[PDB]
Design a protein around this ligand. Structure first.
Ligand code: FAD
Ligand code: FAD
Ligand code: FLA
Ligand code: FLA
Lengths: 363, 363
């Protein structure tokens, strides 16, 4: 006859978004169980995006285009600042950002967040490009996720490897589920989001003491970036293949990335030559994006599903009846190229949604 | 001071081809270690093709177009016949095969292998299509792989989960490696096969006592097949998306597959209606194909790799020196839509190549 928790929540997905959401909920005293196919220890799995990130803080939208994104990025920057003393985040001082034009600098909205923000002289920019410099932050993407999982462990959250094909499979043991499935949201019956799309990103992981970050979007024919991460390594990018699911390494892309990154910063090489670059690994990850932007909202759903709710519902197309329950589904997916830099703010919004739903529907 | 084996081989890949190759080699007394990312217990992993097969025996080429394929298929049919008494293979009696024309029947080359081979009357074919009927065989693809793994266990083979990015990582503990990596062959340094390509196959797994197999290639706008497998289930297909990496479920494709399969055989439904079909799961697998056909051959390779051998070689582009060794690489990949039905014959050819290489290079 023990007093049992009335705050059970299932988090579906264990990428940086499911982990961050799960952690703030655990901190709020929720009993959290994480169901996912890919776990933080799967550091080379291509069926989720989180092991492949830079991961740095680089706003990609204006305030008007992405009000939520900016909110989430500002909050996450504050969190990452707090992680520098223990090494879970690292300063990228004198980061260099190049754009094709003034508009590509996004209204400079974040100039109060990144220290020492200032324009760069044309002499310090690629020919014909415009640029700014600032201090931003980066995390070691797989290790950051493992860090969050450790924090979750201490708060009593649990993990389970599972691959869901229909919503009722996630509503096992909880009347509220956080859906942080990335690309998976499209093929789970009861979610069926056709708007989910991948954005392919190929990179080269390099061994280098280079501590300078350079983000170059001034050449529309060649996206390029150099992101140092904790550990004496730098990630050289990159690609943005919208709707591209190809998980194979493109050898031509390798050449373009290294050549371009070498232009940007020869110190990524031992001798300033492409042949002098110490390659550690060739990577391809699929960013989980979504037409219409990231989805962060709570939905009320009736179980069991019927073929009317989902074309992918299981069992016979003709269905009703017994049993029948209403549950809460809190979406958190489609962060595209900004899942890490938005993760803490997004998790905050998710946790507020869960609190609200609990008040309105779960007692 | 024990007498140690001089027949150590590494098998890279644990799909039906790596497993079959490994088993015949183990039977020949080789000491076999299987290195792979995906193992037979990973029955819903989309990063290899073997969990998603029908898997039945359906020749796809003429003798002239695919002499190896036919050889491999004929040998595998014999093996599967031997597995019927213990249930690891099942007869698909009165299988129905529809084609657009006489040429689509491939010269009837296999009519001596499949019992009761005979043409079908136009009345028993889709309008305007031509057809034949015969008894063929099917295996339960993931359970068949688990069966092979059990056989391997008894013969002393071992398994290890590993994801290789460069050949020297596979030549650990053996001077000969069998490369059965499917699509992976394209991105492993030292193999770098740009010809490897996926062929996307979406299917619907259905609960049904239907024991009749129907293969319909008469409608070029709608590939369709119904493959019963051991266990009271049938796999309804399908798609052949050449070069398509999309792992998401296409809801429209679902409708087309079920409608077409229902035309072909209403008993896949409880009431002969689409709504009467008991859906178990929606699946998407990537067939590992290869332009130029499957690759089954032995290659002599010098380690360590240099950037001249592979654009993806690790370390600095400028490389030589110490150490330096020659090893044997036996390729076995690119079986496309016929990996199961060709697996035993292919494994036979692989094992002969290994025997030959051992004679010529490993003592
Ligand atoms: C090359 C590259 C560079 C990047 N660099 C940056 C960067 O510097 N800064 C930044 O902010 N972002 C960066 N990103 C983007 C960031 O990787 C992604 O936004 C973020 O990882 C998305 O996290 P997620 O949790 O939403 O999804 P994912 O990490 O994809 O996790 C989805 C989770 O859901 C699980 N799941 C999916 N379907 C199912 C199912 N059916 N049942 C059970 N579980 C399921 C998966 O297994 C996994 O646990 C980069 C990404 C790449 C590819
Ligand atoms: C829908 C569908 C229907 C089919 N039906 C039939 C059928 O009825 N009859 C038939 O004969 N065939 C059928 N097939 C085709 C059959 O699935 C494939 O030909 C067969 O599975 C190929 O086996 P494989 O061993 O070559 O490759 P895979 O099964 O893809 O295994 C490749 C292995 O290599 C590992 N690997 C890859 N890269 C690396 C790396 N870098 N390091 C470590 N390991 C690595 C993988 O993890 C895995 O272990 C179908 C396939 C599908 C998708
Ligand atoms: N966010 C990273 C991306 O996903 O590639 C970028 F900073 F490099 F842009
Ligand atoms: N071999 C199967 C395929 O890969 O889809 C088929 F028989 F259905 F064709």
């Amino acid at each position: 006859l023990m007093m049992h928790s009335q705050k059970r929540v299932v988090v579906l997905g264990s990428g940086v978004i499911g982990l961050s959401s799960a952690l703030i909920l655990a901190r709020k005293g929720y009993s959290v169980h994480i169901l996912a196919r890919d776990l933080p220890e799967d550091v080379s799995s291509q069926t989720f995006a989180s092991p492949w990130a830079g991961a740095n803080w680089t706003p990609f939208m204006t305030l008007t285009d992405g009000p939520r994104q900016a909110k989430w990025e500002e909050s996450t920057f504050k969190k990452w600042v707090e992680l520098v003393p223990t090494g879970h985040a690292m300063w990228l001082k004198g980061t260099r950002r190049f754009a094709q034009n003034e508009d590509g600098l996004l209204g400079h909205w974040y100039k109060d967040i990144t220290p020492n923000y200032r324009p760069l002289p044309s002499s310090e920019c690629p020919p014909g490009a415009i640029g700014v410099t600032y201090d931003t932050l980066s995390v070691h993407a797989p290790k950051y996720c493992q860090y969050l999982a450790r924090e979750l462990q201490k708060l009593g959250a649990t993990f389970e490897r599972r691959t869901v094909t229909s919503l009722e499979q996630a509503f096992d043991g909880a009347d509220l589920v956080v859906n942080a499935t990335g690309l998976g949201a499209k093929s789970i019956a009861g979610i069926d989001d056709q708007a989910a799309e991948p954005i392919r990103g190929q990179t080269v992981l390099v061994k280098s003491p280079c501590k300078r970050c350079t983000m170059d979007s001034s050449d529309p024919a060649s996206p390029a970036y150099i992101i140092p991460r904790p550990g004496g390594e730098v990630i050289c990018g990159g690609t943005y293949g919208v709707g591209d699911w190809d998980l194979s390494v493109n050898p031509e892309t390798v050449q373009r990335i290294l050549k371009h990154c070498l232009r940007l910063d020869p110190t990524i090489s031992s001798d300033g030559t492409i042949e002098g670059i110490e390659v550690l690994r060739h990577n391809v990850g699929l960013r989980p994006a979504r037409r219409g932007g990231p989805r962060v909202e709570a939905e009320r759903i009736v179980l069991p599903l019927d073929r009317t709710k989902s074309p992918l519902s299981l069992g016979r197309g003709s269905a009703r009846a017994a049993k029948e329950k209403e549950v809460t589904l809190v979406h958190a997916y489609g962060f595209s190229s900004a899942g890490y830099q938005q993760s803490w703010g997004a998790a905050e919004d998710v946790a507020q949604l869960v609190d609200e739903a609990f008040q309105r529907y779960h007692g």
